[PDB]
Write a protein that binds this ligand. Sequence first.
Ligand SMILES: Cc1ncc(COP(=O)(O)O)c(C/N=C(\CC#N)C(=O)O)c1O
Ligand SMILES: Cc1ncc(COP(=O)(O)O)c(C/N=C(\CC#N)C(=O)O)c1O
Lengths: 406, 406
Amino acid sequence: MNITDIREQFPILHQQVNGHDLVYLDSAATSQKPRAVIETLDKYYNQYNSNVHRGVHTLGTRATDGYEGAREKVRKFINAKSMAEIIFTKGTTTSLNMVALSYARANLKPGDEVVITYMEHHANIIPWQQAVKATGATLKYIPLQEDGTISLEDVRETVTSNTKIVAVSHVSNVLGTVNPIKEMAKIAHDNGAVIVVDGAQSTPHMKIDVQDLDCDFFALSSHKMCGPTGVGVLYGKKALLENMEPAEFGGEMIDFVGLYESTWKELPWKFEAGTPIIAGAIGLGAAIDFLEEIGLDEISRHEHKLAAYALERFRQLDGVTVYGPEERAGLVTFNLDDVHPHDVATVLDAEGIAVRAGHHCAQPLMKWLDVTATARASFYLYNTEEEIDKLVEALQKTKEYFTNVF
Amino acid sequence: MNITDIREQFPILHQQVNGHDLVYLDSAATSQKPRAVIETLDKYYNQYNSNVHRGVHTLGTRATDGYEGAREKVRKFINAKSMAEIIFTKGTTTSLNMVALSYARANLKPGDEVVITYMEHHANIIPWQQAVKATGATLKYIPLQEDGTISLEDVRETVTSNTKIVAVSHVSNVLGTVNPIKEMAKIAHDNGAVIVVDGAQSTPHMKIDVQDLDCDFFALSSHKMCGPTGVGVLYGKKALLENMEPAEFGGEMIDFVGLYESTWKELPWKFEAGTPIIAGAIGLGAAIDFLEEIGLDEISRHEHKLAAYALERFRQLDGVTVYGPEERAGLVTFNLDDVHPHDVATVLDAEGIAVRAGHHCAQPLMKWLDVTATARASFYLYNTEEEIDKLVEALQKTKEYFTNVF
Ligand SMILES: Cc1ncc(COP(=O)(O)O)c(C/N=C(\CC#N)C(=O)O)c1O
Ligand SMILES: Cc1ncc(COP(=O)(O)O)c(C/N=C(\CC#N)C(=O)O)c1O
């Protein structure tokens, strides 16, 4: 894996911001795209754009083969058994809402529990809030240990035989924690629950195998993994999706329409209402071809190196707190003592450096961390140690600059 | 309006299919894109891709300004009063589902009526089926007159003071009928109903003015109007959207998140859960700039000419039935006596000609037409009379060829 060859594929990296070379360290908010992906979209619109599933004219057939072909690429990529288990959606958020709407709201009664964790992104919180409220069921949180990881002991404690759903994140977008999803699926099942896995932060960065994880549902977002905006996937076990009603209704997802009553398509089309995200899914396919060609394990090793290097160089700074465990995915959330993270982010941008400041859509987590906001640098396959040097050099500068003011 | 200059902007038109120049007559299924749109996407991914609404780094600000800027372009384009009334969605279908979920399901009780018409696309049928079933309300259909138009008399007949919702299409994707939306909004309101307008076929092809139409909701799809796939709009009167709960929950659409209860953003963000369709909305903005620069009235005049020419040259063929009225949008649905439309479409593709065969997602309409399927040619700003000549010449050939077989 050659990082110079990789960065050469991402036009957006080669520019300056505020007179400094761009240092993009915000891949957890969204990733940048290689030429292979952008040229996939261009070729689609330049050459074979048409609506799909009719199969009567040439361009229509090509578009359909592209779109269905990308479904197959997603299937192999996360090791699902069947294309019937791969549903294209607008994103992780919509995917998780569909499970909340079609599965939760139809399978929860007073006394039933939904179990989540304190570290969850909103997308994996609010749908469950709404679903328990709609059904008079109960929402519970698995506690976190002090380093921001989860103990299986706490899982057995929180999951009861009244738990219908466990919903947890694969990798935290804030702490960097890789959760024990597989062991959690076992505890879920032992108690008669399904597990729903929020895979938005894991999928771009490490090999996903839904056969090995035995998750019941798994959600991911194209934009975080070198792919177009506006597209995601819901994976669900075929037996569960067969029993769920659609979340949206319309053309494409029907079989017979009468005046008052309709019947549905087979999976996966049951869950894809209206003209689908044709170019986006095809570009998501291109993104998957690109990542597989580098290798998810390679990308993962690369991130292990950047994260270990970042954690070391952060510990060389006084007045800097880092949140979460030592063993982590490729990001670091932190604060400078006595500098608001908004200001850290502003000052970093003046130096070319893109990070995120705020709640990272994890308000409960911030409360648990006893902070109101943090700053975050997040990495991907195009980042380098040199860029981590610039970040830590800029944080040192920031500390001194704000010393000068007071 | 110079058609040669217009066609020069659409790379996909300049190719052959089966050894013949492509003749694309399937714009009602999806439209082709000009360079201005494709290069908008390229420039977004090449240059300023980032997540939106943070506003802490340079690319993030640019992405946000692009996305919010496109909201403004959509607002001016349909003459809404406020960006708070413009919600980006995945498409017409999703837009109509949101109204069905958030407005209908919360405002219908036994004895309440939803009124639709027999000519509606599925997207404007199934959501209402589901909503009346969920609420024990009643669904009614306005009858059609023999030419496939609607009489206001029939509207007053069907809409009662128990009608809560009237949902009708602006322009039929099958008959070509332009419905009397404005007069229908008046009848709706006189009886205490809102009206929901399915604008998927109107928006690409004619000026939209929601102030003049006084519609309560209006839905449209980017892919049909020179814009990217995967994006649409829901317009709704600000006072109605203020009172509707969100259809999806997650990051971006919240204000405060506690463990069990959350509060929402102001409009329009209330209705935009998760990372939004950033590049798609920006490209939809480019599409709108492109169409406004030609002029919707010009595009409309062009289509009037193609439709009048097509209807004339179709009446020069024996054994050809055309469905719907004389005054029409830019398409023609038809059948050859004794040739299945699937076969017509297959034979047309061998000649380079792209049309659609099937139900056109209007199964109730086909039943009313007493057919099981039809063929359809649909036009846009890049089509010509010469291409209509090829179509009618090919239909003549098809008729003779199928005579030979028998
Ligand atoms: C673990 C996890 N779960 C859900 C989401 C939301 O995904 P999306 O916005 O693509 O619908 C995300 C997206 N995270 C963002 C998106 C932004 N901005 C972040 O900055 O951390 C995530 O990381
Ligand atoms: C009047 C009307 N109402 C709803 C839809 C569905 O819009 P979408 O598939 O973009 O969600 C459409 C899309 N129509 C199609 C789409 C396809 N294929 C067609 O072939 O007529 C429409 O024309």
